[PDB]
Amino acid sequence: TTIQVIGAGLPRTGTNSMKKALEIIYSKPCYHMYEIIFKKQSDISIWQQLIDETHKTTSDKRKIYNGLNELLNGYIATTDLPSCSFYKELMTMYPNAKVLLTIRDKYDWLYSLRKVVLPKSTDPWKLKIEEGDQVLGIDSNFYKMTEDSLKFAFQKNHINLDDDEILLECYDEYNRLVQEIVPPERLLIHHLGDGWESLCQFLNVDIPNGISYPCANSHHQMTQLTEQLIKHKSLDDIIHMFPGLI
Ligand SMILES: Nc1ncnc2c1ncn2[C@@H]1O[C@H](COP(=O)(O)O)[C@@H](OP(=O)(O)O)[C@H]1O
Structure with missing residues (x-):
């Protein structure tokens, strides 16, 4: 089992649904941000080390390749941050892996991003997200990894993450860049709502009978x-309220 599909799409572009779609197609696991959160929080420090490496005047590419390979051992694909930011490295490691770019309307994307991943620093909801995440054992370590990997994707060292207009332009530039660098034959651009048909055609498989797209x-x-x-202070006690998520 090795990487067959590289998810280049940014957070809040349907990467979890794509993770689940690929797991249906291949009957093998796909890496995702939620693997880190709900299964493997020890991966946070590893990703942070790899992202930190990219900031050196001379990055150790071999260290990065080895780190990525160990992180993704046992997985057939990967989607979302932090792995999407490394799509060029993953293409080099896995020359026969196809690349998926999940994409959507940039304003819907920014809105979703502010609600879930990157609230503005003085959004009262930010404190609520953090309080809830405490229950899961998620803290500033995770947020730093997330934001650094986003900055890496956007190829910025300095960025005002509270600037909506910058984020919108970085989003368009990121998506444009993916379509430029990845050869057309190993790229599929998958729009939010496209469902099984284009994905299955791209991967040379039949549409799963009687199974809806996630x-x-x-x-x-x-x-x-x-x-x-926040209310129950236990994931176990409430997980029955959130099927098909983690
Ligand atoms: N099959 C589908 N059809 C339409 N939207 C979908 C979808 N699957 C996921 N999404 C949307 O993709 C976003 C989540 O992406 P990600 O998994 O990368 O975090 C959510 O957007 P919203 O927050 O606007 O609802 C979610 O509703």
Whole structure:
């Protein structure tokens, strides 16, 4: 089992649904941000080390390749941050792996991003997200990894993350760059709502009979999850309220 599909799409572009879609298609696991959160929080420090490495005047590419390979051992694909930021390295490591770019309307994307991943520093909701995440054992270590990997994707060292206009332009530039660098034949651009047909055609497989395309991780659901984590202080006690998520 090695990487067959590299998810280049940014957070809040349907990466969890794509993770689940690929797991249906291949019957093998796909890496995702939520693997880190709900299964493997020890991966946070590893990713942080790899992202830190890219900031050196001479990065150790071999260290990065080895680190990526160890992180993704046992997985058939990967999606979302932090791995999407390393799509060029992953292409080099896995020359026969196809690349998926999940994409959506940039304003819907920014809105979703502010609700779930990157609230503005003085958004009162930011404190609520953090309180809920405490229940899961998630703290500033995770947020630093997330933000650094986003800055890496955007190829910025200095960025005002509270600037909506910068984030919108970085999003368009990121998506444009993916389409430029990845040869057309090993790229599929998958738009939010495209479903099974284009994906299965791209991967040379049949559309899964009687199985719907995954559709969870909405910001409405995420907001409910945060609220319920705060209320009950136990993921176990509320997980029955959130099927098809983790
Ligand atoms: N099958 C589907 N059809 C339409 N939207 C989908 C979808 N699957 C996921 N999404 C949307 O993709 C976003 C989550 O992406 P990610 O998994 O990368 O975090 C959510 O957007 P919203 O927050 O606007 O609801 C979610 O609703």
